[PDB]
């Protein structure tokens, strides 16, 4: 079970389990204390649940101090499939794992059960927490790329905060040159025309109305409800009159704070865009090479934190009115629709071969499909920059282009059992009723996909086996 506050360094394990596991080490510690006279004593003392004085918990909790344990996942695919952490005894049945390493082990929380072993020899423990601990193995053995990076939620958070909005651009506000363009367009904003974030090259009135001297100054106004974190404002940082959003300004600090080397915090961060999974990933890599290993660790949780926090306030959820359908759908549909009729007339005559007809039809759809896809995003990118669903996808957060397509636009070509994709596409989106047959049609390719995973889930080491039999030495 996810352990939000937990630190990379550690992991939460049930004291109950701890008792059993570290029983021997516990027994002797008991003798060490007044808890028990001897071993055999300490043992019987623990033979029954109800017969344990609370002093023993303080005994286990003391033995464990310092030492660390190992955790395993269902398929142990790479070395990180096992990591070391310092236990933090906890009540309950469930084990509390850190979310960042939830990437290394392919683990969700729909019930996946992990295992745990104990390194005994002072030596085993030595190697275990030195070269096998979790916070010391950040980078992946596959790609130099970071393995422990802001995963799903954290991003979403860190993203929402660092972003800029834009609104209605009625009057031609290109203030960039006139002084009457400052006065009039500043009043018009106060009016109901020019917004706080309008297309006005040099500066939208939003930047005109507010000028913050010191950093802190910026955030206070926000706090007081004068400025949203995502709005465009001007601030005076170290020798620069930078025109960036509050949110961005803040982000700069979170990092500038995770590592007190502030200037070094600005050199490796790009506050000129919304924080994406890549942006962050990069941030992490830079932080590593540049500063230091353990320091990088700090910044990691630091991000993990604010990410989560901001996420909850951001108030992004998923209602039906979020999966917006583009108006061009019906168009792109009908257009390609009649064109389908053309292909038909062209066949009814005897021009195209039975096969030509087919391949030509699928073609059309394959195109039309890819068409709506870019259409729906264009809708979001243009009208709803902050649509729930869309934000999760663009940001490293969650959501695949194809997936989205299935919701707003439409899932179009499912293949038959064999492979020969159907001639007819699936006109509907998940937003509306994916009809009976349409559904059944989809069900076909569903099985083959599952039939593919099953035949693989069987033996996971097959490939890796061959490779270890010829590479271990």
């Amino acid at each position: 079970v996810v352990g939000p506050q937990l630190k990379l360094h550690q992991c939460g394990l049930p004291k109950r389990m701890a008792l059993e596991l570290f029983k021997p080490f516990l027994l002797k510690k008991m003798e060490e204390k007044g808890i028990a006279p001897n071993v055999k004593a300490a043992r019987r003392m623990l033979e029954r649940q109800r017969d344990i004085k609370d002093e023993v918990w303080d005994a286990l909790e003391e033995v464990i101090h310092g030492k660390v344990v190992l955790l395993n996942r269902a398929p142990t695919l790479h070395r990180l499939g096992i990591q070391a952490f310092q236990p933090v005894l906890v009540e309950g049945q469930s084990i509390q794992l850190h979310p960042l390493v939830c990437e290394a082990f392919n683990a969700d929380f729909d019930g996946d059960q992990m295992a745990v072993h104990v390194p005994l020899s002072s030596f085993a423990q030595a190697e275990a927490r030195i070269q096998m601990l979790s916070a010391h193995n950040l980078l992946s053995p596959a790609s130099g790329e970071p393995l422990a990076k802001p995963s799903r939620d954290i991003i979403l958070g860190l993203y929402y905060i660092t972003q800029v909005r834009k609104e209605k651009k009625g009057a031609g506000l290109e203030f960039a040159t006139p002084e009457e363009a400052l006065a009039a367009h500043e009043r018009g904003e106060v009016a109901l025309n020019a917004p706080i974030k309008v297309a006005g090259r040099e500066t939208s009135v939003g930047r005109l109305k507010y000028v913050f001297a010191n950093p802190d100054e910026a955030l206070l106004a926000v706090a007081h409800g004068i400025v949203d974190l995502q709005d465009v404002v001007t601030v005076r940082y170290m020798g620069k009159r930078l025109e960036t959003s509050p949110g961005r300004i803040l982000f700069a600090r979170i990092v500038a704070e995770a590592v007190e080397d502030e200037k070094v915090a600005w050199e490796l961060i790009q506050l000129d865009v919304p924080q994406e999974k890549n942006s962050l990933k990069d941030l992490v890599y830079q932080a590593f090479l540049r500063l230091g290993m353990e320091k990088t660790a700090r910044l990691l949780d630091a991000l993990k934190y604010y990410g989560f926090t901001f996420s909850t306030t951001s108030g992004i959820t998923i209602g039906i009115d979020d999966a917006v359908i583009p108006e061009e759908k019906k168009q792109y549909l009908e257009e390609a629709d009649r064109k389908l009729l053309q292909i038909e007339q062209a066949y009814e005559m005897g021009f195209l071969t039975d096969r030509e007809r087919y391949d030509q039809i699928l073609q059309l759809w394959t195109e039309t499909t890819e068409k709506v896809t870019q259409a729906v995003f264009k809708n979001f990118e243009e009208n709803y920059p902050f649509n729930p669903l869309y934000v999760m996808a663009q940001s490293g957060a969650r959501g695949n282009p194809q997936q989205i397509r299935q919701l707003c636009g439409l899932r179009g070509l499912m293949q038959k059992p064999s492979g020969e994709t159907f001639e007819v596409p699936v006109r509907s989106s998940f937003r509306e009723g994916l009809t009976v047959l349409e559904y059944f049609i989809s069900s076909h390719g569903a099985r083959k996909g599952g039939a593919d995973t099953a035949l693989r889930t069987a033996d996971s080491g097959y490939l890796t086996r061959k490779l270890v039999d010829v590479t271990h030495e």
Binding site: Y210, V211, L219, L220, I226
Partner: protein, 229 residues
């Protein structure tokens, strides 16, 4: 006392400079650290009455967006540095004080250049306001008031001199509040809130002070639930 009451909050303190001030206090029952840190924060950012520039008037300047010869700095950047200035009166009698300043020739007009005013002190002497060159005239009057929270220059719109210009009001001596509620273990039960808030202050007042004032404003407010009707 020895059990429940002696287990009273261990209000510990850490304050370096009249600016930063950490405050720790534990143990606390389930979710109280939050119930405390939050309101106090709200107070520390709005209630703590303070002082700051609310209006400015320049010699020959009429508009906020103008430039003064011999003066590198621009009206907007100067009215900005003013927001940085921190003053301090000593008694209710001072609601609104107008500090005067007039400097000419090659000089770096700092805040210490303002003509002294009896019941007023300037915690920001060396603050940079402008760099004057040859033939640089600079005669101004900057209003100062005692208020609470943030007030956009648009909201008040002060009117001393018709050509004067309003500045955003930053009275709150507090720069920023920050409270954390990390778990702590005392014996039998582990679920224990451990509140610890960090306070920043411009200098006028001190963290400790601010906190004290804050908690009082609350206390006092809790009393208004006295006479029903």
């Amino acid at each position: 006392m020895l059990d429940s009451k002696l287990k009273a909050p261990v209000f510990t303190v850490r304050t370096q400079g009249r600016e930063y001030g950490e405050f720790v206090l534990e143990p606390l029952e389930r979710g109280f650290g939050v119930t405390l840190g939050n309101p106090l924060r709200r107070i520390l950012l709005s209630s703590i009455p303070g002082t700051a520039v609310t209006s400015v008037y320049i010699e020959d300047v009429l508009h906020e967006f103008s430039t003064i010869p011999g003066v590198k700095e621009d009206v907007v950047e100067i009215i900005l540095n003013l927001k940085e200035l921190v003053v301090r009166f000593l008694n209710p009698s001072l609601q609104t004080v107008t500090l005067l300043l007039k400097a000419e020739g090659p000089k770096e007009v700092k805040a210490r250049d303002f003509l002294p005013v009896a019941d007023v002190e300037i915690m920001n002497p060396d603050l940079h306001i402008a760099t004057l060159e040859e033939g640089g005239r600079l005669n101004m009057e900057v209003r100062v008031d005692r208020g609470v929270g943030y007030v956009p220059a648009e909201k008040h719109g002060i009117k001393d001199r018709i050509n004067a210009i309003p500045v955003d009001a930053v009275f709150s001596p507090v720069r920023r509040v920050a409270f954390q509620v990390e778990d702590t273990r005392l014996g039998q039960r582990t679920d224990l809130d451990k509140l610890t808030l960090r306070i920043w202050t411009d200098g006028s007042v001190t963290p400790l002070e601010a906190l004290n004032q804050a908690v009082e404003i609350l206390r006092e407010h809790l009393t208004y639930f006295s006479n029903p009707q």
